Write an enzyme that holds these catalytic residues in place. Structure first.
Site, PDB file in Angstrom:
ATOM      1  N   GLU A 255       0.849  -1.222   0.000  1.00  0.00           N
ATOM      2  CA  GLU A 255       0.000   0.000   0.000  1.00  0.00           C
ATOM      3  C   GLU A 255       0.877   1.262   0.000  1.00  0.00           C
ATOM      4  OE1 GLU A 255      -3.597  -0.152   2.315  1.00  0.00           O
ATOM      5  OE2 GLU A 255      -3.312   1.914   2.998  1.00  0.00           O
ATOM      6  N   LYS A 256       0.570   2.190  -0.903  1.00  0.00           N
ATOM      7  CA  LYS A 256       1.394   3.416  -1.078  1.00  0.00           C
ATOM      8  C   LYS A 256       0.736   4.642  -0.411  1.00  0.00           C
ATOM      9  CE  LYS A 256       4.233   0.768  -3.244  1.00  0.00           C
ATOM     10  NZ  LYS A 256       5.336   0.276  -2.393  1.00  0.00           N
ATOM     11  N   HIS A 257       1.523   5.404   0.332  1.00  0.00           N
ATOM     12  CA  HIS A 257       1.016   6.529   1.076  1.00  0.00           C
ATOM     13  C   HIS A 257       1.851   7.823   0.811  1.00  0.00           C
ATOM     14  CE1 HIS A 257      -1.085   3.542   3.953  1.00  0.00           C
ATOM     15  NE2 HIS A 257      -2.058   4.422   3.731  1.00  0.00           N
TER      16      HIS A 257
ATOM     17  N   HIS B  82      -4.030   5.430   8.390  1.00  0.00           N
ATOM     18  CA  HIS B  82      -2.568   5.199   8.404  1.00  0.00           C
ATOM     19  C   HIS B  82      -1.702   6.429   8.664  1.00  0.00           C
ATOM     20  CE1 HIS B  82      -3.939   1.574   5.860  1.00  0.00           C
ATOM     21  NE2 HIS B  82      -3.594   1.106   7.064  1.00  0.00           N
TER      22      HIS B  82
ATOM     23  N   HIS C 260     -11.723   3.944   4.432  1.00  0.00           N
ATOM     24  CA  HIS C 260     -10.266   4.069   4.334  1.00  0.00           C
ATOM     25  C   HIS C 260      -9.945   4.894   3.086  1.00  0.00           C
ATOM     26  CE1 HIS C 260      -6.069   1.794   3.669  1.00  0.00           C
ATOM     27  NE2 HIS C 260      -5.873   3.050   4.062  1.00  0.00           N
TER      28      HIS C 260
ATOM     29  N   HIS D 294      -4.040   3.668  -3.806  1.00  0.00           N
ATOM     30  CA  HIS D 294      -4.427   3.502  -2.378  1.00  0.00           C
ATOM     31  C   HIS D 294      -5.942   3.234  -2.335  1.00  0.00           C
ATOM     32  CE1 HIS D 294      -5.536   4.804   1.775  1.00  0.00           C
ATOM     33  NE2 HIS D 294      -4.300   4.431   2.115  1.00  0.00           N
TER      34      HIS D 294
ATOM     35  N   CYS E 253      -3.705   9.751   5.453  1.00  0.00           N
ATOM     36  CA  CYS E 253      -4.642   8.623   5.317  1.00  0.00           C
ATOM     37  C   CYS E 253      -5.466   8.552   6.633  1.00  0.00           C
ATOM     38  CB  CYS E 253      -3.827   7.325   5.090  1.00  0.00           C
ATOM     39  SG  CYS E 253      -4.892   5.804   5.166  1.00  0.00           S
TER      40      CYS E 253
HETATM   41 FE   LIG Z   1      -3.984   3.923   4.049  1.00  0.00          FE
END
Ligand SMILES: [Fe+3]
Ligand SMILES: [Fe+3]
Ligand SMILES: [Fe+3]
Ligand SMILES: [Fe+3]
Lengths: 124, 124, 123, 124
Positions: D11-13, D112, D45, D39, D109
């Site tokens: 997962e890319k943030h 996150h 989310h 994402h 996020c």
């Molecule tokens: Fe996330």
């Protein structure tokens, strides 16, 4: 209008404006949604923000006083409604003013569109 | 670093965090810049916003609680510093919280960069 | 009515909406103020933000798509109109949509009040 | 530190900064999260916003260029993930810049936490 003005019976969305003080050149305004009958605040349904606008008597244009974003709605890595953090949709704007005039507040429910409340500011 | 953390002698930028109330599973947190030595608020130099973050103890990630934008700084069709409306850089964030944790606030001066303050929320 | 809808001769305030792409319901919408006749952008007078709202046909309510704030207006420790940095009031909103519907954009000038523009999204 | 800088695998943030155009004294900078590996964008989310900061070389302080909020994540009166409307976390910031300098992007996020990206604007 896009801006709804009359609350339904069982869920409150209209932002309510309370002038806490307005004298000595200084103003404090509280704006809330669902102060007495809370609006839901879940990951899936919540009030996202309130913006307050003030147009002094004699000003040709209104001014945005400020905006409050309510950003926590329980989401977490463990699922929706698991973080134990929920931002309540109530904000306090403190500002200088030199004249009385008109207050307008706008608010947004992520599933029930846009809303407007209005109040007079009588500056002592 | 980008987020400055120690005030200078003459002008105050570090956002100051105060727990006003914690009762019924709701916390009220005031954040302000310059409550004691006021920061300028003019068309040219003012605090634009404060953002509050809360990481409950045991939570792997922090959550944004909310953001307050202070939008009026005197500008009008008559020129800078003439509208008589100035938004003070003070906000109150009311949120449900279940646990102690770490409060961090960020704030921005339009000419003096980005700032951070920190405080502990103790619920027992 | 707080939301002005008709531009003046010499200064442009109405947010103008251009759908750049609406294909497969991958939608890119550009919104700007003063694209052809630029609005001032000084420390004292500027466009502070634009917000885009979309109401799909069949949706009882509209949804905020997003908001773009334009924060730099040349202020610095050397005085007003000295930083060399000014954010132009143009934004692109990329979003997914399943149905055609109505776009509404809002914008704000720190001295000339609030403004509204409208357009149709035909997928 | 609150601002995470290195992506996980699945997962890319980290927000990715791209200078799209630089001419006539105006620069266009795109900032996105998950352009290659998207994402998630669900009611539960999603990336909520990206902010871009620019510090011209030789400037003692950084300036916020602007902020983009991505406000639609599928919520509707029919439940989560039913509205048909989802805002992709990509923004374009166009701004006048006189000098090379350092670009910093921040993003959030909702489960996150906070993220930072950096890049250089080279104008010659
Ligand atoms: Fe996330
Ligand atoms: Fe609602
Ligand atoms: Fe300052
Ligand atoms: Fe204007």
């Amino acid at each position: 209008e896009l801006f709804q003005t009359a609350d339904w019976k069982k869920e409150k969305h209209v932002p309510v404006i309370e002038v806490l003080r307005a004298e000595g050149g200084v103003v404090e305004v509280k704006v809330s949604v669902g102060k007495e009958i809370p609006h839901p605040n879940t990951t899936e349904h919540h009030i996202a923000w309130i913006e307050l606008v003030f147009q002094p008597e004699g000003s040709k244009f209104p001014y945005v006083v400020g905006r409050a974003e309510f950003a926590a709605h329980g989401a977490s890595v463990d699922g929706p409604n698991t973080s134990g953090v929920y931002t309540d949709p109530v904000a306090v704007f403190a500002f200088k003013a030199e004249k009385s005039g008109k207050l307008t507040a706008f608010s947004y429910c992520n599933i029930h569109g846009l809303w407007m409340g209005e109040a007079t500011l009588s500056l002592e």
